[PDB]
Amino acid sequence: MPKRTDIKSILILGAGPIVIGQACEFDYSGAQACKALREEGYRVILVNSNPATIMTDPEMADATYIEPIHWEVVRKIIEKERPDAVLPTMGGQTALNCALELERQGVLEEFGVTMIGATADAIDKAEDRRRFDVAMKKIGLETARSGIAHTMEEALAVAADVGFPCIIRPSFTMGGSGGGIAYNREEFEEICARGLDLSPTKELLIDESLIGWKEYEMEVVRDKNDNCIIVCSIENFDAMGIHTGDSITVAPAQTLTDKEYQIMRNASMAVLREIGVETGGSNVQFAVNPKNGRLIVIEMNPRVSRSSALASKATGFPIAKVAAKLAVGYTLDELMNDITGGRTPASFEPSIDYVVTKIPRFNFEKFAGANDRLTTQMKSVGEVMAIGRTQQESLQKALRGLEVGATGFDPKVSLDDPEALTKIRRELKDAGADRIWYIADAFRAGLSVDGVFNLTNIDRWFLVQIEELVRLEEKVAEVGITGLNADFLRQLKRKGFADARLAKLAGVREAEIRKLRDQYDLHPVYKRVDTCAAEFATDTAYMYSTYEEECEANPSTDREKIMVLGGGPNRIGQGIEFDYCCVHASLALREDGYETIMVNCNPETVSTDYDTSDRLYFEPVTLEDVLEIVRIEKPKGVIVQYGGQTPLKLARALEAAGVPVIGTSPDAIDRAEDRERFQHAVERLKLKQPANATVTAIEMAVEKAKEIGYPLVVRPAMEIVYDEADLRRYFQTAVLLDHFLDDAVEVDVDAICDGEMVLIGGIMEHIEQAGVHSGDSACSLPAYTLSQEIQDVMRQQVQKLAFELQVRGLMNVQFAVKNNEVYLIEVNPRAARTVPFVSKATGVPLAKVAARVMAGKSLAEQGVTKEVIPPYYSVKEVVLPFNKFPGVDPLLGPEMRSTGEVMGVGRTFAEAFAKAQLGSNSTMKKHGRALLSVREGDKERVVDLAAKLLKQGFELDATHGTAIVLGEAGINPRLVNKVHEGRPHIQDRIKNGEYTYIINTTSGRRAIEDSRVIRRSALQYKVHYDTTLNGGFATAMALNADATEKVISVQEMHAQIK
Amino acid sequence: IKSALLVLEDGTQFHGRAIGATGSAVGEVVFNTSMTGYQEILTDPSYSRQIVTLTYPHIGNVGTNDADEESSQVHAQGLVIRDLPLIASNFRNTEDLSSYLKRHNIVAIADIDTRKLTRLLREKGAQNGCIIAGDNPDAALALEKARAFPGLNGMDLAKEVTTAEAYSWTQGSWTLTGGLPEAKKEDELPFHVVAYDFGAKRNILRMLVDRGCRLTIVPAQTSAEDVLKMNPDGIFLSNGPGDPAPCDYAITAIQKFLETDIPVFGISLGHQLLALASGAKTVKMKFGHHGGNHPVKDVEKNVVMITAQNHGFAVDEATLPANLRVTHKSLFDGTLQGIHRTDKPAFSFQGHPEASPGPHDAAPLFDHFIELIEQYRKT
Ligand SMILES: Nc1ncnc2c1ncn2[C@@H]1O[C@H](COP(=O)(O)OP(=O)(O)O)[C@@H](O)[C@H]1O
Ligand SMILES: Nc1ncnc2c1ncn2[C@@H]1O[C@H](COP(=O)(O)OP(=O)(O)O)[C@@H](O)[C@H]1O
Ligand SMILES: NC(=O)CC[C@H](N)C(=O)O
Ligand SMILES: NC(=O)CC[C@H](N)C(=O)O
Ligand SMILES: CC[N+](CC)(CC)CC
Ligand SMILES: NCCC[C@H](N)C(=O)O
Ligand SMILES: [Cl-]
Ligand SMILES: [Cl-]
Ligand SMILES: [Cl-]
Ligand SMILES: [Cl-]
Ligand SMILES: [K+]
Ligand SMILES: [K+]
Ligand SMILES: [K+]
Ligand SMILES: [K+]
Ligand SMILES: [K+]
Ligand SMILES: [K+]
Ligand SMILES: [K+]
Ligand SMILES: [K+]
Ligand SMILES: [Mn+2]
Ligand SMILES: [Mn+2]
Ligand SMILES: [Mn+2]
Incomplete structure (x- = not known):
């Protein structure tokens, strides 16, 4: 049948904030679901607490709810929206869990909401591991x-x-x-x-x-007519034992014979049939005994996933889009294949004439105390993808596009290190994030393929290929740049070697290798993705570079092109927010009439969705790769300011290679990023900046420290030192020196300048004080404590900076407010991670606007001149990954560690804050017993907080010091023992669940390391805890509010704006 | 350095590396989109006189083995690939690709832009070509050979690959656990099927054995009279190379069978042959269907099947006699894929129900054929 007619309205459950294991892939899929259903004339209602999602763009749906993804809130939405059906398959696990709770709570029945895509029973039959096992046994x-x-x-x-x-x-x-x-x-x-x-x-x-068996995955699609297809097969590089997400994976399967592949194929279909997925996709995982082909089913995910997104990107078959349509009656045969001009149906199995490689991206360096070994629990924070005509090519490209400083197989251990083989051995046997690089070092050291196999269990088929690269690297090293004739260099490029890598071996700068290529006229060609190994023509322009004969680029001469550079794989501090900005640029300029070119290789994102741009180059976002594309596209302008650090670091080289970079110049940016050039501007403008020094030696800093004043902020990683002794201390374990602004209010200000005027996009007031990285702080828009007076100063200061720096497009400035005095922390002459948040609260698509400006259309011209101040409070809160790395102290500091964020909308700050808190998955309760344990400076303020909690009906506990101060205030908490004190101590009490709240503030390398147990225990037992007094006051305020009381759509929000 | 060269009729040249025997190869050039099953593909007699280009870049990842041979030899005229892996990596392998090719004396070339070639064949249609592998490959010679190739249209190749003398087949399908079975005993097979060897694939035979048919493989030219004398439970028309058209003997004989009540079933070439005897016409496709992901709709049930295709000619649906009903169509191009005689127990499929390599979705085609057989024995 065609589309269902008993359904007019659909509610889509979104994934919520980004976390390790549940990332961007869900904005991509939810965006595709929304677009597909809206295309088909349905009423789209969706809920997603993450504001930096394209899927929540107001224009993407009918009723968009940026509210906490809690069953009670969803119940409100439902009630209010009265959806005919709920699609729970496009929001990861959050969505699945939530649809099942809604169901259990009898909400679906209550509002006659129909579950489409997958039934509650099918979801359970797959999610319930016991049921799953049974099902398998049933089908044999x-x-x-x-x-x-x-x-x-x-x-x-x-x-x-x-x-x-x-x-x-x-x-x-x-x-x-x-x-x-x-x-x-x-x-x-x-x-x-x-x-x-x-x-x-x-x-x-x-x-x-x-452990050690081969690991495979298949992405399947099934329709109500029982038509079923394999969209993609995936063979894992890393064997069974390392999660698929933390593994290097390739499409399609490489080492299965046709006979084995058919068995796997047949089994995957049978799995879906048995679980009961009849109108959508599912991912099916297997393990294969390389010694005898023995097949074992592992699991199945009754929804879209990170792998379905990888798969969609890999074959060019938009799984989520298709699956959405199938959810409402459509059959595969009735839909058309996007990429082949819609000349062929969706009912077919793709065939690819290339190799897709995915490499996970980690951030261990940010989790000092964490176990950095790869296991079954995902620890990756992102991923990169690459396409090549060969595996070697595919793999190498992925490596150089990983954004880790790799240019390919760079060495990790020296050849003359006697201890090398030992480390290498360890790194192979027990895999960490660096293993891929250790594998080449092993071949460099004399290890055989078999040797490496026995330790890693990674298929020889892959190993022999790496070794080949090494041997080739050895020849290059040997012949030097002189031996780099046109033939040899071509062979090298065909193997995926980066100029940068060749450069290093030959001992020359990268530009020298590139010079050589220009001399030999050695350039890549671009092939297109088409889902069908070129069996049919395409009208889409989704390409990748390779060193072959025929080029399919066929750039237009017709239009004015605008290129947008993405950020590669996401990492902490470089997430979706930047991607979001990148997408908006594309959509905006494309709508304005430009030919938009997107350059990126993050498989999880909407930016690498062929629908987002006129032409997509799924390439490493490197100088080499980007120059080649520019070479043939000859764009009008290139935006490097929206994909974060990655594209920003390229700006100078690009400009110098002759790239028409638009918006804020490379130099201006430099002006701002460079500590020195900046100090100089600030000076020139007569603005306030914390005392600073640039020390070279220990004793030098002690002296200078004396000068500057304690506390101190030591920027090389970032720490805060308190006393002289504290300085040495650091120095041991351990350079900018800055005075630390204690008890200061942090603020973020996002704005736009067109060289004629400055548009204030948004002033955000952080809940956590300066010292807790902006990226890890909750924030309010509008400010909830700052004076109008003080805000105006900042606004003024922004404008000064804007012009001075010659900003053209977005900029962000960070301030600190101490004693009614405004101090400048830094300037970010680019799009900031806060842009998406601001766009959503204010209703102004900042990225779009700045994009238009960069492209030549003044603010005035756009009609976006007045600062918006919403008639509501918007609060942003973050989500931290501490639960993934237990051995880490779950405490806030000057280094950003959060992976995602949420938004809370309210008529009052408290109401906003409560929505944001609940949305961040907090376990806060409105009753119980609280545990107070604060540091010196906080001792004064904690009394009020204690009172606040008391007013709330909470019972108090406290440690000695704290008890003292409260007692002296008339507040007698129940004394509790530190751990070295006796029994029971905090630890015991926490564990038995005595507390529902914890406020624990510390200051001092020792005081911190001492108190570590309180935080680790709080996290492990699921007790909401605040590590800042400011944080505690917010939580307290929030107790007064009801997050489930009222819900509002973005559309409605926006409509409230004057 | 081991040079190799591939030249098309139109003058297009592809320079690569030799991965097989030394020499020259000429034939019609085709592209197959199968990501797996290269050995099976190479050993398909249907590929006789054709130069096979594989769109999946890495070919030989799993090496080769006997059980993966669809015939006694490699029938493909030449193999054209993008990349030959350093090693074969599969428990089933018994000999690497290159070694296998040399063994079978096959001229093969690697390291060429198979995508460019594919796109060319798609856009311009099939083309004859010549691969030359040796010390110094003569591009003008290769172009000569290619231009001189008589071509597949009007070429009977079925009579070329068929068996000399009739023989029995009672061996079943392969299994992961047990491998290839021991040939059944005649008394262990209920039905007796007479199968015309037009260059039949082993899997078809095995599968038929799987369903209880003991077989008698007969030369392509065998008369209907001789067959009829064996008292067949059913008559099967195998797959095979060239044009079905010029196979007068077969068409003639088939017509005879069509006078009788003996169930007839045919696959690919056999489908064609059936259609011809029924008075339908066959055409040469622009580039054909070569792959394992081809959607075919069963128009009766309105269900889709992912199939294995291997054909350059098709039955014109617009010349089909009223006694020939359409049963399946390509969802890719709308071409005819299945037919059933409205008045006789005879039917055929353009695709490969037996797959090998490819999806098993179409195997039920066989069951119908059993039905007929069962019913026929009823009478
Ligand atoms: N029996 C096993 N032996 C070794 N590794 C296993 C085994 N079962 C699963 N794994 C590993 O655990 C990972 C997680 O298993 P999985 O069932 O997919 O759970 P999840 O839903 O969390 O992804 C798999 O990707 C795999 O590498
Ligand atoms: N001089 C300072 N006084 C107080 N807090 C500071 C100071 N410098 C930086 N911080 C804190 O450090 C965080 C990060 O510092 P910043 O210079 O902005 O580094 P990054 O490049 O990571 O953005 C800020 O968000 C803030 O909380
Ligand atoms: N790259 C292209 O512009 C290809 C155009 C043409 N439709 C094809 O698919 O061959
Ligand atoms: N695959 C076969 O059995 C025959 C196909 C037929 N020879 C063709 O090329 O159309
Ligand atoms: C992966 C997201 N959660 C599990 C569904 C944990 C953060 C939502 C609470
Ligand atoms: N916004 C950061 C998370 C807040 C956490 N509850 C803490 O106070 O440590
Ligand atoms: Cl989970
Ligand atoms: Cl086993
Ligand atoms: Cl840990
Ligand atoms: Cl070539
Ligand atoms: K309903
Ligand atoms: K599961
Ligand atoms: K079991
Ligand atoms: K794995
Ligand atoms: K998976
Ligand atoms: K802060
Ligand atoms: K910065
Ligand atoms: K070549
Ligand atoms: Mn899994
Ligand atoms: Mn799972
Ligand atoms: Mn900052």
């Missing part, structure tokens, strides 16, 4: 030997049965959340306990080890 597929556990006791029994190592997998979780590999009883109990508490169904499945 094999699964590893396992046992279900609902308690520790239960668990220990399975362990006893399967032996160690054993794999632990919770029901109702993904990205390996709550799981891992137990190598002993100690590890085992640790994992299970965490897994049992995390699992929404309180259930664990423990399986025997298949």
